[PDB]
Structure formats: structure tokens, C-alpha cells
Amino acid sequence: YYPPALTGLRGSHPGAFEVAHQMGWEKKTFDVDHLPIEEEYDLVVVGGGISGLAAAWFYRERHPAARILVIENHDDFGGHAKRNEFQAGGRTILGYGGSESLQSYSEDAKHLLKRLGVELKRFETAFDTDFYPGLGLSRAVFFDKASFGVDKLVSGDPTPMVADEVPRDRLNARSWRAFIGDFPLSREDREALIALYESPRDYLAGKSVEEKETYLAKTSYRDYLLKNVGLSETSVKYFQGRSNDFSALGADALPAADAYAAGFPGFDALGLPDEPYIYHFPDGNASLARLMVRDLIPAVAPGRGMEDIVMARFDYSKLDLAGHPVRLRLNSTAVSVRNRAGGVDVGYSRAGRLHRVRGKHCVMACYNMMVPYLLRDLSEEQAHALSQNVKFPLVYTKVLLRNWQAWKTLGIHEIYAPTLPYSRIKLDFPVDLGSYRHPRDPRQPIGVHMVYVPTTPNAGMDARTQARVGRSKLYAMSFEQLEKDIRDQLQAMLGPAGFDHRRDITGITVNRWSHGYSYFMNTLYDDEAESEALMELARSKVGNVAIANSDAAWDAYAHAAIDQAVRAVREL
Numbered sequence: 168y169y170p171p172a173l174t175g176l177r178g179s180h181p182g183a184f185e186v187a188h189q190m191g192w193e194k195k196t197f198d199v200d201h202l203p204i205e206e207e208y209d210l211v212v213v214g215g216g217i218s219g220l221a222a223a224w225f226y227r228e229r230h231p232a233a234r235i236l237v238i239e240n241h242d243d244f245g246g247h248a249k250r251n252e253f254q255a256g257g258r259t260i261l262g263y264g265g266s267e268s269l270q271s272y273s274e275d276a277k278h279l280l281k282r283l284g285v286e287l288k289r290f291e292t293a294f295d296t297d298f299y300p301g302l303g304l305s306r307a308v309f310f311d312k313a314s315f316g317v318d319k320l321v322s323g324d325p326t327p328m329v330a331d332e333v334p335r336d337r338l339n340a341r342s343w344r345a346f347i348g349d350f351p352l353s354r355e356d357r358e359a360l361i362a363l364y365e366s367p368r369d370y371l372a373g374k375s376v377e378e379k380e381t382y383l384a385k386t387s388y389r390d391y392l393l394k395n396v397g398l399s400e401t402s403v404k405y406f407q408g409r410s411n412d413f414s415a416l417g418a419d420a421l422p423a424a425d426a427y428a429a430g431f432p433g434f435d436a437l438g439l440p441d442e443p444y445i446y447h448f449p450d451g452n453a454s455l456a457r458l459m460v461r462d463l464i465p466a467v468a469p470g471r472g473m474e475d476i477v478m479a480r481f482d483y484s485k486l487d488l489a490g491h492p493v494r495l496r497l498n499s500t501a502v503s504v505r506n507r508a509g510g511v512d513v514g515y516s517r518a519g520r521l522h523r524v525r526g527k528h529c530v531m532a533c534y535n536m537m538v539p540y541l542l543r544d545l546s547e548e549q550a551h552a553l554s555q556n557v558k559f560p561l562v563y564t565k566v567l568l569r570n571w572q573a574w575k576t577l578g579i580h581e582i583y584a585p586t587l588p589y590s591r592i593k594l595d596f597p598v599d600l601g602s603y604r605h606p607r608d609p610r611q612p613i614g615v616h617m618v619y620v621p622t623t624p625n626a627g628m629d630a631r632t633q634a635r636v637g638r639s640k641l642y643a644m645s646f647e648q649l650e651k652d653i654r655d656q657l658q659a660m661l662g663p664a665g666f667d668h669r670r671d672i673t674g675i676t677v678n679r680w681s682h683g684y685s686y687f688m689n690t691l692y693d694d695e696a697e698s699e700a701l702m703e704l705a706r707s708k709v710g711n712v713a714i715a716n717s718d719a720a721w722d723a724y725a726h727a728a729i730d731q732a733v734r735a736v737r738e739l
């Protein structure tokens with residue numbers, strides 16, 4: 168029993184969500200008040216992600232002898248932080264199923280990393296930052312026939328990005344004029360894009376700095392480019408999907424002020440008033456989850472420290488052993504949380520069967536939108552606040568390739584596709600850590616990472632609706648349909664250099680994050696003071712039940728997941 172080696176439809180896989188959807192969609196309720204209490208703990212944690220795991224860890228630090236149960240509905244621990252594995256040519260090749268890297272922090276977060284043996288500066292040498300640039304490789308843009316008239320792959324992209332692992336002097340980029348000159352657009356559209364970089368103008372002339380800023384927070388980037396810079400509808404399509412990965416929506420939902428702060432073009436002349444993105448374990452932040460699980464339940468794997476975790480062998484049969492004071496219980500959907508007698512009764516469903524356990528304390532570390540269906544003591548106001556945290560769907564696909572000669576031939580290590588389902592397609596980060604060595608030889612297998620976000624661009628939707636509609640679209644897609652999109656797009660982009668998707672793909676893992684990033688405050692649709700009041704109301708302590716998850720901070724980062732766990736534990 169070893170989830171990390173599974174391929175196919177992963178992420179929120181079949182079996183993880185059905186009981187939750189009976190509560191959320193059908194309003195079925197699962198009461199356990201008539202069942203005997205089976206087990207008793209000091210702390211019961213709902214949700215086995217980084218935040219739930221952190222809550223167990225900090226609670227135990229404060230209560231060394233604590234008995235702790237973690238209830239988790241996926242078939243593996245870690246939530247968004249999942250380890251993916253491939254086998255090729257005798258060796259394991261690692262990938263990240265979701266939460267990707269760390270930055271370089273509260274004292275509590277520092278204290279957690281140190282106690283786990285995570286030295287952040289180790290990545291200065293573990294991340295092979297000059298590997299792809301040293302091979303002469305650059306980032307490219309892929310234009311699709313349907314949108315631009317013809318398929319064209321344009322390399323040498325100098326566009327600077329928010330979470331950039333490439334040293335800026337090492338982009339192997341061309342000039343804006345040279346690079347844009349190759350765009351499959353009319354001469355007029357190319358001149359207009361080029362002038363965007365070569366000859367910025369004050370497109371908001373007349374307005375003071377304060378009025379410009381107000382305007383930019385209430386105007387989408389797309390509209391700013393359309394109405395103020397004057398780019399054509401065909402030009403702006405170049406920008407449509409650039410924000411898909413880091414914000415979970417396209418340029419039509421990106422506030423222009425947020426585009427400015429992300430380094431997007433168009434603002435240099437308005438008169439308005441970086442760190443290497445290399446903190447990446449070979450399986451992403453699943454290492455952080457695995458680190459905590461081993462530290463919490465030492466029978467699961469041997470060793471200690473950030474080096475040997477990478478290839479440590481986890482025995483899942485040791486996760487949920489009684490007597491062991493910390494127990495992690497997978498494939499288990501919590502359905503009921505109720506204060507009683509200075510304790511908390513927790514009900515969960517497992518293989519269709521209901522169970523009841525007790526803790527003195529409870530931390531709700533699951534999706535915040537799930538909490539109203541579980542916590543029976545919520546006022547209507549707080550339940551409603553919780554339900555306003557509408558999470559964004561994302562899909563992170565791992566693809567194993569026989570070789571990557573087609574990438575070498577095309578001179579690329581990463582593609583941006585403005586309008587296709589997958590907007591980000593890249594050879595995986597080259598990272599050597601512990602006994603794991605990143606693939607090096609283009610004749611040999613390598614992992615590809617690629618990001619698909621089911622946005623509905625230019626429809627007039629607010630962000631919450633784009634999120635919910637995105638989930639409807641994902642729900643309506645079989646694994647077969649997802650696989651076709653992968654193979655169709657890889658074939659169209661790499662086909663010209665000899666790629667053959669049927670011959671050259673030797674593994675596919677689709678991590679379906681239907682409930683991906685936490686909601687965050689979007690100044691195009693939300694009022695800041697109202698949004699903050701909703702946030703603080705939603706995470707309010709309820710008796711002996713505290714609420715965590717990154718959701719509780721409206722902030723989709725592993726460090727928010729840790730700090731919300733810390734706050735929750737201290738309240739208890």
C-alpha cells in the first residue's frame with residue numbers, strides 16, 4: 168500500500184470526495200451521536216495537510232504526552248503536498264503533485280524547519296541553477312493555430328516572472344524587438360507590443376498617483392491593456408494565461424495593480440512607486456509533509472533530516488497503530504464535530520461506515536468551506552463566512568518522457584502557452600538532494616511538469632464564479648479527456664522536432680486539485696475591509712474547536728498553513 172507510486176488520475180482522486188459531496192451537494196447528514204465512543208485522544212485534527220500535520224506537531228511540542236489523531240480523506244497524507252513517483256531505466260524519478268516550493272518566515276515556521284532538519288541554504292548547492300541555462304536553453308511561448316492562425320514556438324523569452332529559478336543574467340533571452348518580431352501576429356500588433364517595452368507612455372496622464380493606484384486596483388489587466396494602453400483584442404490574447412499558475416485566473420481577473428506588482432509590462436511610465444525560487448525538494452513540499460509524518464510517527468520510516476527523507480521508504484501500515492500516541496488515519500471523511508463535556512466528539516466515515524471518537528481539543532485543518540457541514544455549533548454568521556472561502560481549481564500533471572532530445576533541439580526548458588489548456592509546460596526543476604540525482608542526459612528519461620487551469624476567460628465572471636465553474640468543468644472530465652489534452656498539446660508543441668507522444672510518453676500522472684488555492688481578496692470584486700472581517704469571523708474559535716488550514720488566512724502558501732496551525736494550537 169504505497170500511494171506515491173500510483174499514476175493516472177491522482178490529486179483529489181476517486182474515493183476522496185464522495186462522502187464530502189453527499190454533505191455539500193445533497194445535504195445528507197451523518198450523525199454519530201447514537202454510536203459509542205470508540206477512541207479517545209487529547210487532540211483530534213480534521214485534515215492531513217501541512218496545516219493539520221503542523222497542528223499535531225506544535226500541539227505535541229506543547230503537550231509532549233498528547234494522544235493525537237489526524238483524520239484525512241485522501242488515500243495519502245499531505246493534502247496539496249503529495250509525492251509522485253515514476254520508474255524508468257531502473258531508477259526512481261520524483262515529482263511534486265501540488266504545492267511546489269518554499270520561499271526564504273514567522274519564528275514558529277523557522278522553529279519547525281530547524282527542528283525537522285531543514286536548512287534552507289542547503290538548496291544553494293542542491294538546486295542545479297545553471298543546468299538548463301548552461302545547455303543554452305531558454306523559455307518559449309507556444310502560439311496555437313486556432314488563436315493566432317498558425318502554430319509557432321518562439322524561444323528566447325525575456326519575460327521576468329514572480330517565482331523565478333533562473334538567474335536573470337542567465338535567461339538566454341533575445342531582445343524584445345527580436346523576440347516579439349517572431350510572434351504570429353500582424354505587423355501592427357507586433358509594433359504595438361514592441362512599443363509597450365521600447366516606448367512606455369503615461370496611459371493614465373492627468374491622474375495623480377493616488378487616483379492611478381485606485382483605478383489600477385479596480386481595473387483588470389486585460390481591460391487596462393485594452394482601454395488604456397490601446398492594444399488590440401488579438402494582442403492582449405498573448406497575456407491571457409500568463410497569470411494562470413500563480414494566481415489561478417487569467418488576465419481578465421488579474422487586477423492591474425497586481426499585474427504591476429508581478430512585473431507585467433505597461434506601467435514603467437505611469438509614475439507609480441526577485442529572490443531565487445530554488446527551495447525545491449525533488450517531490451516539492453511533500454517533503455515537508457513527509458518530514459513531519461516521520462517526526463510524528465517514527466515507525467513509518469527510518470532516518471532524520473532533510474537529506475535522507477528524499478528517498479526514505481514510508482511504511483503506511485505504521486501510520487495508524489494504537490498505543491503509538493500519534494495516529495494518522497487515511498481514506499476517512501470527517502462528518503461531525505461537536506462540543507460536549509469539555510471535549511469534542513468527532514464522527515468520520517471510512518469505507519462507508521461511521522465511527523465516533525473523542526478528543527479534548529479539535530483543530531479543523533480541512534478546507535474552510537467544508538467546516539460548516541461538520542461543526543455543529545457554528546452560528547449562521549460564522550458558517551456563512553466559512554463558505555465564502557471559494558477555492559480555485561488547478562491541475563498539476565506529471566509526464567514521464569523517454570528522452571528530451573526534442574527539447575534540446577528546440578532549445579527550450581519551459582514553454583508558456585497563452586491560450587491552451589496547459590499554460591505552463593517545463594522540464595522539471597533539476598535538484599540533487601540526499602541520494603537522488605536529477606536526470607541529466609537528454610537521451611534518458613526526465614519528468615515534465617505542466618499546469619492546467621480551467622478558467623472561463625472574458626465572460627464577465629467574478630473570481631468565485633470562475634472558480635466554481637472551473638470545478639464544474641473538471642467534474643465533467645473523464646481521465647480519458649484529460650489524457651487527450653495532455654497528448655494533443657505535447658504533440659503540437661514538440662511534434663515538429665521529431666516528438667511522438669505515443670512512442671515518447673512513458674508515464675502520466677494527473678493531480679486534480681478541484682479545491683486548490685485558498686480564496687484570496689481580489690480588488691476587482693471584493694471590498695478589503697469586508698473581506699478581512701469575513702476572514703476573521705470565519706476562523707473564530709468555537710468552544711474547544713479551533714480552525715486552521717491555509718484557507719483561514721486567505722493565503723495559499725505552506726507558510727500560511729503552518730502559521731494558521733500555530734495560531735489554532737495556541738488558542739487551545
Ligand SMILES: Cc1cc2nc3c(=O)[nH]c(=O)nc-3n(C[C@H](O)[C@H](O)[C@H](O)COP(=O)(O)OP(=O)(O)OC[C@H]3O[C@@H](n4cnc5c(N)ncnc54)[C@H](O)[C@@H]3O)c2cc1C
Binds near residue numbers: 213214533
Ligand atoms: C497546485 C498547487 C500548487 C501549490 N504550490 C505552492 C507553492 O509552490 N508554495 C506554497 O507555499 N504553497 C503552494 N500551494 C499552496 C498549498 O495549498 C499549501 O502550500 C499547502 O499545501 C496547503 O496545506 P493545508 O493543510 O492548508 O491544506 P490542504 O493541503 O488542502 O490540506 C487539507 C486537507 O483536508 C482534507 N479534508 C477536506 N475535507 C475533509 C474532511 N471532511 N475530513 C477529512 N479531511 C478533509 C482535504 O482533502 C485536504 O487533504 C500550492 C497549492 C496548489 C493547489
Ligand code: HEM
Binds near residue numbers: 192638641642
Ligand atoms: C476532484 C474531485 C472534485 C471535484 C471534481 C469537485 C467538484 C465540485 C463542484 C463542481 C462543486 C460545486 C462548486 C462549489 O461550490 O465550489 C464542489 C463543491 C464542494 N466540494 Fe468538491 N470537488 C471535488 C473534490 C472535493 C473534495 C476532495 C472535497 C472535500 C474533502 C470536496 C468538498 C466539497 C464541498 C463541501 C463542496 C460544497 C461547497 C459549499 O457548499 O460551500 N470536494 N465541488
